[PDB]
Write a protein that binds this DNA or RNA. Sequence first.
RNA 1: UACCUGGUUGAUCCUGCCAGUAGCAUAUGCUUGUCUCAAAGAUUAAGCCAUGCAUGUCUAAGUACGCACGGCCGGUACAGUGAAACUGCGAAUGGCUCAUUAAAUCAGUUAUGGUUCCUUUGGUCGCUCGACUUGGAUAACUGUGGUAAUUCU
RNA 2: UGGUGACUCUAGAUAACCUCGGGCCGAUCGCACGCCCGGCGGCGACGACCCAUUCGAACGUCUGCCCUAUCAACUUUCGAUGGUAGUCGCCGUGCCUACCAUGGUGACCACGGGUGACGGGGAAUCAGGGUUCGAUUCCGGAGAGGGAGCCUGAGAAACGGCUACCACAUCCAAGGAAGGCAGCAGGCGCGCAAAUUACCCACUCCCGACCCGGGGAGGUAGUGACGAAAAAUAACAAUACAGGACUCUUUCGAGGCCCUGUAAUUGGAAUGAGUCCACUUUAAAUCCUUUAACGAGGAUCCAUUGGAGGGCAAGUCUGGUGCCAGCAGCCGCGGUAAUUCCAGCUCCAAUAGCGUAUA
RNA 3: UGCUCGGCGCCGGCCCGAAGCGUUUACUUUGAAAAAA
Lengths: 262, 185, 124
Amino acid sequence: ARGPKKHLKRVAAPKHWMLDKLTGVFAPRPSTGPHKLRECLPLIIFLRNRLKYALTGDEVKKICMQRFIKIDGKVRTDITYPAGFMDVISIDKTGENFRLIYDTKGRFAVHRITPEEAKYKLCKVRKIFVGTKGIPHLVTHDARTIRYPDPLIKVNDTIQIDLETGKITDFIKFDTGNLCMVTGGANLGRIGVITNRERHPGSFDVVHVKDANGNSFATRLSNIFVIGKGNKPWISLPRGKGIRLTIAEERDKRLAAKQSSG
Amino acid sequence: PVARSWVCRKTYVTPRRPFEKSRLDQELKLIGEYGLRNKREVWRVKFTLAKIRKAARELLTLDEKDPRRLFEGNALLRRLVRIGVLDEGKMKLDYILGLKIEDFLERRLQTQVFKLGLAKSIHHARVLIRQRHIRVRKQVVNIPSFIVRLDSQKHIDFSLRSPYGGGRPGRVKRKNAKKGQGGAG
Amino acid sequence: TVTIRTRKFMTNRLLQRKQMVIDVLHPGKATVPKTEIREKLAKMYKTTPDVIFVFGFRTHFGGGKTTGFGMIYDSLDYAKKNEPKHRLARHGLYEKKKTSRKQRKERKNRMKKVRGTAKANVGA
RNA sequence: UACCUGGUUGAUCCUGCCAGUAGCAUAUGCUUGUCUCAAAGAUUAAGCCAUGCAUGUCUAAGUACGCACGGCCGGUACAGUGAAACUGCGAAUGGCUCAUUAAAUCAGUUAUGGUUCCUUUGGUCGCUCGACUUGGAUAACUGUGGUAAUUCU
RNA sequence: UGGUGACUCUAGAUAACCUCGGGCCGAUCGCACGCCCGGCGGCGACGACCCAUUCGAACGUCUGCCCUAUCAACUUUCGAUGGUAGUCGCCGUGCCUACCAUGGUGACCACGGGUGACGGGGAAUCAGGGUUCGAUUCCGGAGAGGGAGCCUGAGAAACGGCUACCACAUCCAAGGAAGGCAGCAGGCGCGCAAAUUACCCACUCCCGACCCGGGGAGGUAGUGACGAAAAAUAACAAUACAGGACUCUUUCGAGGCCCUGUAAUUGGAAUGAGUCCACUUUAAAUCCUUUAACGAGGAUCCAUUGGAGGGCAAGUCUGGUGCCAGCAGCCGCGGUAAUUCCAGCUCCAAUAGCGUAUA
RNA sequence: UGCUCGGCGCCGGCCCGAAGCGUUUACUUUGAAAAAA
């Protein structure tokens, strides 16, 4: 190991990519980008698996190079570009838009959205930075640096930006009572209400999240992505609403659907 | 680094005491009754029964109102009543331990063909299944180790390509007719 | 004689084609060749026998039903634009060179053995 | 399947081990009709290798006076394809082996507030108070030599 | 000003420095072409000192490794432990220097030695508890004969880069050149032990100035009884005869449907290996599936491997040598009446598989 | 288990909530973080 890796094996891929075993030894290693390699989604996998617009790896490249792919309002021509969490995908040829958000379980799911909703993007600030002349900065989770924000923005206050210019439009404070999203972890993709937060010096802070059906769980502070002001959210939730319904109720609902179908 | 599978398992099991009287005569009785080629098939059914019995014992070693025990037990009872080993009334986890191997062998394909009345004998049913004459759910099967489900039991008829339940006459009938026509004139 | 029924059909305007799944139902006969399937699917869809590319026809056990994949384009230029070359060679619309890769590799080594204008004539 | 049987004695109870019984993975021997998967110079020699191949690369967007092809009214140079060569990028990835190594490697948990980082993404790029385009060298090419040979000059 | 659990943190202010082996402050290239009156404009490509981010790398904290006392004390100013100040390194620290004190570990096993030791995720066996293996497709580590030193590059002590050593070794007019298959095929040597000097970038990805080129990375086929899953070598009817499941002549006998089993008696129904047209699969085929014309009555279209005293299912069978030849994992059989040897008949065990030897 | 700031109610005030603290261990139980095959 005299340098960085360039090849990724098929079984070394994360499970939320949902690759198969017999079709080849290698896996598409994503290029370096805004999101981490372990938590992202390449454009090739999404295009050839979630919608099946292509069949081979050459055909999705023929799809991608012709400037028919818009990610975060900008045209992307890379087949290994990491399209991570909360990103927006715009297809102007078919007039359809997609937003990359998690399902009830730990994987990405497709989500059709209206074009008028596809103009903003919620981002979580990582740190508050002061510039070279006393000017304030802001680093989001996708490393989009914003200059001159609102001075009430704190270290973990999620903001709403606009795609075509890059300006701050609105923000949600981090307080107990706001509806929240979790990214990364065992109970990934759950919708709940933040109730408590423990402050551990020199370690990781743990908050307590209460579901709408009275279920309670916990996770680290860095896996907290608040999306709502109290109870009403800002983005339309998908089917299932991230409720994490149990296995027995899942089987009961599946047999209810099966005997309703016939 | 190739794209292979490398996964396999042994389906039968070898018994500890190979050289005896009682269960050897019992296995010969099962072979002569239900028409089996060798003892590897009956050892395979004994191994499947042993796996089901071990799963049932590891389910009964837990406690009542356990979600894992209830879920796996309900799945096992649903699969066993889908196969047809058990009855709808006796849908409990304790009825798994009180079944034998001939309950598995009543749902074999040769036994069902013989008991449906469209076969002469058990060995005749086996050699007729192996020779591609009987279809189920309009799909022609070839194999006699076919576990017939409860919902696919009333759809066992002759194939449409067979010379028995409608089709072209066979090779030896046309050969005999052509030989008789050549000899007559 | 031959009955065709379609399933899993969708139209992608991004690739300007129509991909689908073709099933062939031939009771008690040999499997139908790809050409007859091409004009049958063409006269079902009211399109000329030119822009249909079918591949991967597997026959089930029993000889009653086969499964396959096929794409219907909108024009012959687009059918020549985004399509693998081997199906074009199967339709006779494309031809490749017959030189083996060993001769090409030895030619590459012979051209890398020399330098300058000699690469054009020394390397074959 | 929470399993034992033969053997010391004229004969009987014990310690005891021997030998049977079943799986596994290496070789060998005998034998052989269909079909689906699939290991395979690892144990001795990380011993020696004749041969052929395994890393090359152009778009509208860095250099085009090779008639190697080739468009016309030819005078505001350069229509276009363009081998070769200069330039930048990768060759530190992938593949093979288990010879060293016994708090050494590695595994789970932590920290860099004790450092660096190709490329991608985002910001910065008239924030300094003092030319309507500067210069000479080499390729490729032409011509000409030594070597028994080299991707030698 | 802003933050952390916490700065000698970021920013602010003042007085200087700022390396010619030199930090930035655009002398680069295409597309569509324009409005105002020579200036003024859009979409990109390339490069760039800087920050954050991404793939990482690097040195650290806590816990966890096989055997051994025929290894009980080990290391030390040729650094072993700590302190002060420096050099180098991308930083942190004896990593290394100059000066100081004699420190540090050990019976809870240091130190020393061996390993047929790469480590782990794992595999076999399996009541429970355990034992053995892990070179082997994934992760991490080391090496390219083995030590040593480097150039370039962001990232190398790189070897399909260079330099020197020893060991081996190719060509040679003898003055000199050229070396590294523990890569893909293949040869020699070694051994009980292990395959084709084949085809292709179509599938999975990787690199490049990049829809277009390349890839023994890989994919395809061949060798293949390591091993695993399925499964042909026959079925039926009538004559071959011993009588019961039902009733019966004191007893044979007989009513007798399903009979139950068996002899080269006969008879029509059948499909499969293989020969092959076509279709299909595939970069082009072969494999498989489909479908024509052929194709079973000693269905020669011929099923083997070890055993027959006990453990350990199965002959006081016959003939031969008769403590010889041999069998026998253990008891023991072999003496001219051999249930064990050597041949023929019958029979039992798994049956495309079976037996033997080493872990 | 108690001694500086303010709540779902009310007239200098009752109760509750809370910045701060309120013997360390082993054991036991619930959670997090835990690559794939």
